[PDB]
Symmetry: C3
Subunit: 456 residues, 3 copies
Amino acid sequence: NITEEFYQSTCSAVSKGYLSALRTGWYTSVITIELSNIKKIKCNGTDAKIKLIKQELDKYKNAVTELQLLMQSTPATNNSGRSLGFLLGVGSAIASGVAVSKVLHLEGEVNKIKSALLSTNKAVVSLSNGVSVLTSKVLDLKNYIDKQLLPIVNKQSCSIPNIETVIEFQQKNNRLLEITREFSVNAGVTTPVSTYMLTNSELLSLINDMPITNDQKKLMSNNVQIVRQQSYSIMSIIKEEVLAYVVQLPLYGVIDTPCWKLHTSPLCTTNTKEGSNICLTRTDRGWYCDNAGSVSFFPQAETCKVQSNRVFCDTMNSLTLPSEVNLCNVDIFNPKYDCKIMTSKTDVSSSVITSLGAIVSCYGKTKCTASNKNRGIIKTFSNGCDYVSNKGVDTVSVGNTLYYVNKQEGKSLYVKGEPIINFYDPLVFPSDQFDASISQVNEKINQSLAFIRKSD
Amino acid sequence: NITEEFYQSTCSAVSKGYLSALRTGWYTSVITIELSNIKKIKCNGTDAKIKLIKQELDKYKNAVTELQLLMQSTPATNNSGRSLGFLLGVGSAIASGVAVSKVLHLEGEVNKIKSALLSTNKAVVSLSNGVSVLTSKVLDLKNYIDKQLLPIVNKQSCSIPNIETVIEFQQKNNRLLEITREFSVNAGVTTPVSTYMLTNSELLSLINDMPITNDQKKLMSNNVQIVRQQSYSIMSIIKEEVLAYVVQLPLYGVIDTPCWKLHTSPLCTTNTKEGSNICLTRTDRGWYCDNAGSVSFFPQAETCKVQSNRVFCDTMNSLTLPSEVNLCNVDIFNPKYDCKIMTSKTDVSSSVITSLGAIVSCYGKTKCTASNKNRGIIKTFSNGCDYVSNKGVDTVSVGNTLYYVNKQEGKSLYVKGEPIINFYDPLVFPSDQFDASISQVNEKINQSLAFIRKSD
Amino acid sequence: NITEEFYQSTCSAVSKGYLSALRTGWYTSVITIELSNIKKIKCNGTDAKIKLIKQELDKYKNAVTELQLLMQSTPATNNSGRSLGFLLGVGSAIASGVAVSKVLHLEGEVNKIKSALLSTNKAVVSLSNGVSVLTSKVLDLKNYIDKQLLPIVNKQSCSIPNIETVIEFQQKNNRLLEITREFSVNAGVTTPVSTYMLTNSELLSLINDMPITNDQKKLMSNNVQIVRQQSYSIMSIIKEEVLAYVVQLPLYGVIDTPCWKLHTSPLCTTNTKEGSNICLTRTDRGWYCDNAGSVSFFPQAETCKVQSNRVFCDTMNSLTLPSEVNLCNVDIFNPKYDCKIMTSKTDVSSSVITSLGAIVSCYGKTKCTASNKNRGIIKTFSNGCDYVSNKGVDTVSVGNTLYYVNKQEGKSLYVKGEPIINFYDPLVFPSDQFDASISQVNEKINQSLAFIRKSD
Ligand SMILES: [Cl-]
Ligand SMILES: [Cl-]
Ligand SMILES: [Cl-]
């Protein structure tokens, strides 16, 4: 059950009650399509059905040629000021998958995989480097072409095939064309992993055969659409009648730990004289999850995806913080953790739509209201930072911008408190601290009060 | 007619003459596809045409199953330093559509919609919460399957269908497969809204039936491609022989108000001694539109899309500013509005391609020129901030970077003026104001001149 | 051969050995599809095969109508703090292609192109403005419809076509539908250029016919997937039985010059007292390439794509810097170039995965290790900035974040040196310089030491 608290003192809100699903690692499987090596199409027969087969077989050959050009390359991909995103490290997302892909280029490795998938369409193969991977055969065009299409190709006659075969071949070949299509506009690396790359049935089957926990299997199976988005498909090799590409699947090593989302908005003084005001904004907005005695913090919105009450995040775009980082929500002046803020003189109106309400920073001459669809305006905000819950409210207007609020069910709590911006003397307030903290601002103020003390 | 003015004094340019098309709200419609509930396919007949129908019917079932898994989840999506983007608020883009989607999950609501679309393919339905929406039936697979495909499915015989039916069913079923395909790689929420989701005919028809102004209807109909980009499709429910998804359409409450685009570039002193220079840059670049007595300001480029002379913007990514914000273009030291700037010591060369010309910030040893395709170089820029119009110029080169200029027709005006950076004493100039303003810089300078005055 | 050096003194690493492929210009070609102008479909025959042709011909007409609406619009597109991206200029990516597209709207220009492609499918046309472009015909639906489909359309009888024709027409028409599909969700401008827009064969052929250097031809042909990603397709006109769109291809004027990638990470003091530490970070991370006596610098990761040992970059998102910018890697206090840094007090742990290793910034209580897959943990990092090569290491863990390292072959060199953060007195260290440099920090320190000197 989702709950939420608004802190009037620091113009921020925390949404609690969420459960974690953090991608901590990677699982790499090798997906294969058995191809028929065919060059020639010996047939002078100008029959229309033969022509259609020839045309479809021509697309097949071009796809193979196109993929061979892609194989020649080494796979690679590249994955505000009020957020702490600039503090993040830089990972290499497909480094694990690529490492597997490189092994597949080694001679004998290809033939090794083909041997394992001879009788079955699912097997585990020991690679020459000493790594085991789940290998899968999802399509056998080699079988179909050699069994259904050989007499119309391998011989001058060329016994004209039935129309149903012409249709059937186009259906089966289509998947190869679409896979090639995706790789060719994505430089051999795609994400999310499409159903062409891996069907719902194949993915669900792959998950079940993944030697992971029953909880992980259940988790991934109930959230396939999220798993696809956190996965990569990496074109590897097309060699000796087999196309192989590496599918890089998320590994969720952290599950069902409490998560909370922190929303922040500018807190300024509200003096009538334009420009005589000072502002303060908590910059530690984003998702937080308890994780192994510490806290995983995700500054950027793209990193986390919410499904009902479960949060799917990627640890690559996170910081590991002391659990005392949560103290900034209860006591921003706590002596255990230096809470991060930014200062400014720019008092501009804006709103933050939270999980269960809306934070409104209303300043100057801005019209700020909250409304119900039936009644209309039910609350007019005064200057300063305020909050309203989603219960009874459908929209919020700040200036010329209309925000719809989330209609998620859950209780909000308004925690009254003196706006902390009122505690500072504007005469010595540093309003140029773009990336700062509580203590760093205090330090600046003490220096300013010192240079004044020297003068006095 | 587009015009443009360059202000030499502040190294910036304003492009006028544009008309507004601002998305201010949302309209939510419910799109439905009538599905045939079929499980069994009773037929032992091994006929090739039967096999093709069976295979296509199998794709149909997998799509339905796949969509049912998507329905189980709650829809969600996540929508530099020289820009003021960090000042923006945070909205919830699909909060309105999702609110409608949740209503559709309530029992009876599904049957209520199906009743309205019984005789017609277009109707308005009162939802149990008390909200009316345009509901539409775009595909009836239930009818086709039950009328054309029942004897080959519901019975052991299984009278073999004609080849044209096999083709026809694949054609009709394809749309369902593609819709499912899009939702499955987008976690149930897609944008822009594709033609699979809503065809050009259906969208145009929907717009005409939308009880909006004739101007809005005309506007949306002439710019369908833009409307699609500003729309969301939200997978809702697949229950009791009907697939329903919510299409969230833009509502343009502001039309044909004057808009202007502000371009900015660094203004530095040009002393010969490397590193002895100070820089200044207007940070209020972006789109501006008159709006309800105020000005809607769009700092980020992605927010606005230009079609000829009309600007399509989203108010969610805007600030509402006093109209006096425009005074920064005429008099940056005006006493009515504190114009936003940033300071630095980093004098690096760069160019900004405007609507009707190019701003060039040329510093140090950088080669800066403007050229015509026929003649070649026609102007060599000196150090400082300068400008050239697109009339007679095709390209501009700054260092190793070649920019093509926009060949839009329109008059440019060069407004001569002393570069304002020359007004500051470098000895007391604060060059560490990453996010500042005219008065904030003055305030810093007065403090510096005070600590000096105390010493003296 | 790729090599790498880590500088302990400045917590940074440089990866050498790369070769350049910089997009410096644009080549614009005009792609055409000959369309059949057909309105009526005179046939009362209710034959199933006729019905299928009618339905497919209906899609053809809707595509044409849809494209005509797109033609009505003017094409346009819109193309952290630890990066210097905010220093970049603003170009207009499709300004060159659009300029060509505008010429195509002029009367006679359309007929001029159609005349050139009358006998051949490849020609060079002089446009009325005085610009020559490679024009190409990739599909002739006009021929097919008028030759194979006229009697079933132009007459009440309507001699029922064979089933193979029904299939064939759907195959040929499909490309038109997909092109229309892409343009309609991309407002007439697509990137990367798909195989629908331009097939692998057509693109390779176009490249060979492009009057460029043999090196460029070889370069583009071996990296087609990259070329597609650096290309635009711009819907222009559909008028007088011909659809024409402009394909904007990359021009690589700089090839095989040495490139290097600079990786940076925070360097902080490691005092036991939490918050008593000061930090310093090189902000000039990104790709560097020698270019015409200067250096092209690419701050943003998206700008450059690496294929094996060759770097594909776009000069539009670059700065042109003096070659002395490289001195920051050898001597950050060099008197020839003012190396860019940022200061802070926030000592947060993070890692940067490099080309041939990993930089680890470990601070506070963070667990920082490096591991082999077989052995496990082989190195535990102490507080400070350290480095490990990819040789023998597969993963690196910083806190709750596991990074896979790149398994690229190449030698790393560890350049020992005193961390430069140790050279600063914390009592006068400016930790609020979000965008600064070596000299700017020194200047601040000298001022602080002056106000102290006055007091003394
Ligand atoms: Cl909204
Ligand atoms: Cl350009
Ligand atoms: Cl990783």
